[PDB]
Scaffold this active site. Structure first.
Site, short mmCIF file in Angstrom:
data_model
loop_
_atom_site.label_atom_id
_atom_site.label_comp_id
_atom_site.label_asym_id
_atom_site.label_seq_id
_atom_site.Cartn_x
_atom_site.Cartn_y
_atom_site.Cartn_z
N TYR B 159 44.48 72.25 -12.42
CA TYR B 159 44.12 72.58 -11.05
C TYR B 159 43.25 71.50 -10.40
O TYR B 159 43.09 71.48 -9.18
CB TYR B 159 43.39 73.93 -10.98
CG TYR B 159 44.28 75.15 -11.02
CD1 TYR B 159 45.53 75.12 -11.64
CD2 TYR B 159 43.87 76.35 -10.42
CE1 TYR B 159 46.35 76.25 -11.68
CE2 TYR B 159 44.68 77.49 -10.45
CZ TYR B 159 45.92 77.43 -11.08
OH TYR B 159 46.72 78.54 -11.13
N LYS B 229 46.41 78.61 -24.68
CA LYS B 229 47.78 78.35 -25.13
C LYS B 229 47.59 77.13 -26.05
O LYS B 229 48.21 76.08 -25.88
CB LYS B 229 48.69 78.04 -23.94
CG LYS B 229 50.19 78.11 -24.27
CD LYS B 229 50.60 79.48 -24.75
CE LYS B 229 51.69 79.42 -25.82
NZ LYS B 229 53.05 79.19 -25.31
N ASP B 282 50.14 83.73 -23.48
CA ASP B 282 51.39 84.46 -23.30
C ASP B 282 51.40 85.79 -24.06
O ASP B 282 52.02 86.76 -23.61
CB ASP B 282 52.60 83.59 -23.67
CG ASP B 282 52.59 83.11 -25.12
OD1 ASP B 282 51.50 82.88 -25.69
OD2 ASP B 282 53.69 82.94 -25.68
N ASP B 306 43.34 82.32 -13.51
CA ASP B 306 43.96 82.68 -12.24
C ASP B 306 45.11 83.67 -12.44
O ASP B 306 45.18 84.70 -11.76
CB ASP B 306 44.45 81.42 -11.53
CG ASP B 306 45.05 81.70 -10.16
OD1 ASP B 306 44.57 82.62 -9.46
OD2 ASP B 306 46.00 80.98 -9.78
#
Lengths: 415, 415
Positions: B159, B229, B282, B306
């Site tokens: 980001y 992740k 995930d 987010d």
């Protein structure tokens, strides 16, 4: 020598002008898989055979050919031969194949056979169809409104593995370049910082989106949604959405709706107007819960595709029975998305759902939609009848416990 | 000159030894906000005042001081003065502040006042508490099992905006460096490829995780889950989880559980054993749907924070009433997460939920948990009584329609 016996009856699938020429008795290669693959695969072969026999009444038949990879490849070819080269040759030559779970030669062996297959055969598309089956216990109130098909880019993005460890000479050199040569002012703490690269090319984007739309046309779907976080990551995610929309116009004659970014592609076989739209990833995650019926075919990048798939499977209660496929330009590999579970290997206990649904994806990919329709119908009926395997049974009150094999028969009974 | 009148009564909040010294009559600066801010803010001030008055029975009071930013700043200071420097001074000086929605001087103006505030005051933490309020229409079956607090890193990650457009001289130069100088072999299509950088530093990770644990101790929470992740992005996401676990051991005396990666931090005020664990992003997305009660405080990087926040808000039906805060080392800014909606501005129609709950976050941040508890209690009661605003009303059968102001009074009535 080759220990693969090519069937006497059967003809191979041809690839011509982007389309597949599937004969009435195609030879389909299959990898049984390690662990429970010995249980689930036989169930799969039986369910598919019945689906074909019933839908086409003897006019079609599949000549299953067993190829090797994993533990079984060892006892058939040697010792360190986990992925025999001839196996790759056969998947490419026969175009479509289906595999059960594979076991990684842990410790000092070839890292994940699955990544080896995917990369060597350049299977750039991960396809994850997600729909609810009446009776499956779900955490959401209205899971039956979910019926999407995820087209996840599988060769690029942050998942590419291009990174450097914080404090290593490499990481330092890259940061030096970025800040000095590139004038990067946005790295808050340049010290003890790890770096990752997120690439996104026009070709990588175009080839995936192309397939997405092709699929929608081929299966008479209502829409293709380009999912991205383009508002933040403009030159990668945003570029993805741009190239996607560009392709629809140029190649599929997409026309703008109300001048808005949304396009409309007419399905040349049905006349249906396929809507090409887009939603921001973080907003989409809310949308699948609030308005699942508004979505259909989804096209996105690696990471987004991975997150959305897992989130959807959870909603419809299909994590243990999630089908999946890795598709490239020359061949498609359908697979059981679950693990090997050597503990239940041979016990005829586990759920054959994943690989059976992966087979329906295969049949549909072959044009044999009638047969594919029977697998969906059977699955729904069997689950709805509460005649299920242990995993579902323990979550259902009043369920009849069936063995992996018996569940296969139950599916056949509800076709 | 300064057009901000510092109240005669009231003393400012002090920052000493990492903790806040909050007096019984603190001066809290507030930004009304543009658009509907004129409706929601007054409701907020009234609800907070009642909460304080009731919980402490006159022994505490807040001296609200209005500062300016946005459209209102213009009519008070000049024309192009959207974010007056003295406003920044006042937020830093008074430590805590709360703001309504802001309007971006669109076209040729300062891009998003919110990003200007966040970056200049170095508000590196985005805090998003997510819990269900009995009566709120939700898409999931058991939303009442959700009560998490998201700690999202807000200064790094993909980001950060470090990217280059495909085919530009810059993009080409970076790719050249990577492939030639770095020996990068993983970029599939180096042509027409956009590039993005994902940085993750030890400090950026440590400061966020530190606050997460501090919060858990301060509020007697059960656990902190490091979401990442890391299995794919080792040197960034994985590094995040590593530094996180490292900090818990070193600074919080975390002890290993069964030798497993999970640690246990004893809350020095309650004796509770706060579990420090981790889950892959995930997989977490599935977990929040299947086992929401297993999670509490969540610590993650920008992107993950987010996605998870938006996904959770949707589950509990709190998208329109999502509270939020941007916290740094010197000050914390609580805000209404919704837009300005100039169409309903002045109509006393919109839902004051977002900013009211953001106020409870503020009171809790001030140590005034008793008062904060009354805001939660009132909100639940009001929503459960079906005495709600249009947005909720239209989704509820048998609901009594209340105006923004009246909803404020209803909250006060159920305290």
């Amino acid at each position: 020598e080759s220990k693969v016996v090519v069937p006497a009856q059967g003809k191979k699938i041809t690839l011509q002008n982007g389309k597949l020429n599937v004969p009435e008795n195609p030879i389909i290669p299959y990898i049984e898989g390690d662990g429970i693959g010995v249980d689930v695969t036989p169930a799969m072969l039986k369910v598919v055979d019945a689906a074909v026999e019933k839908a086409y009444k003897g006019e079609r038949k599949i000549s299953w050919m067993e190829i090797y990879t994993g533990e079984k490849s060892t006892q058939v070819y040697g010792q360190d031969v986990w992925l025999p080269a001839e196996t790759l040759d056969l998947i490419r030559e026969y175009r479509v194949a289906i595999k059960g779970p594979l076991t990684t030669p842990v410790g000092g062996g070839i890292r994940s056979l699955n990544v080896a297959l995917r990369q060597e055969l350049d299977l750039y598309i991960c396809l994850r169809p997600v729909r609810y089956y009446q009776g499956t216990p779900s955490p959401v109130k209205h899971p039956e409104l979910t019926d999407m098909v995820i087209f996840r880019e599988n060769s690029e993005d942050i998942y590419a593995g291009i990174e450097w460890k914080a404090d290593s000479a490499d990481a330092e050199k890259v940061i030096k370049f970025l800040r000095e040569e590139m004038g990067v002012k946005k790295i808050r703490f340049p010290e003890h910082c790890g770096i990752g690269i997120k690439p996104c090319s026009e070709e990588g984007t175009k080839r995936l989106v192309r397939a997405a739309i092709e699929y929608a046309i081929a299966n008479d779907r209502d829409s293709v949604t380009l999912v991205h976080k383009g508002n933040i990551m403009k030159f990668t995610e945003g570029a993805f959405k741009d190239w996607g929309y560009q392709l629809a116009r140029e190649e599929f004659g997409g026309e703008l709706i109300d001048g808005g970014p949304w396009l409309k592609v007419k399905n040349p076989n049905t006349g249906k107007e396929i809507v090409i739209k887009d939603v921001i990833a973080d907003a989409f995650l809310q949308q699948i819960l609030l308005r699942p019926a508004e979505y259909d075919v989804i096209a996105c990048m690696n990471l987004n595709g991975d997150y959305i798939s897992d989130a959807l499977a959870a909603q419809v209660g299909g994590i243990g029975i999630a089908p999946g496929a890795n598709i490239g330009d020359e061949c498609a590999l359908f697979e059981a998305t679950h693990g090997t579970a050597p503990k239940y290997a041979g016990q005829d206990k586990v759920n054959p759902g994943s690989i059976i649904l992966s087979a329906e994806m295969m049949l549909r990919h072959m044009g044999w939609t009638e047969a594919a329709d029977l697998i969906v119908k059977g699955m729904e009926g069997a689950i709805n009848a509460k005649t299920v395997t242990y995993d579902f049974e323990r979550l259902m009150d009043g369920a009849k416990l069936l063995k992996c094999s018996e569940f296969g028969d139950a599916i056949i009974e509800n076709m």
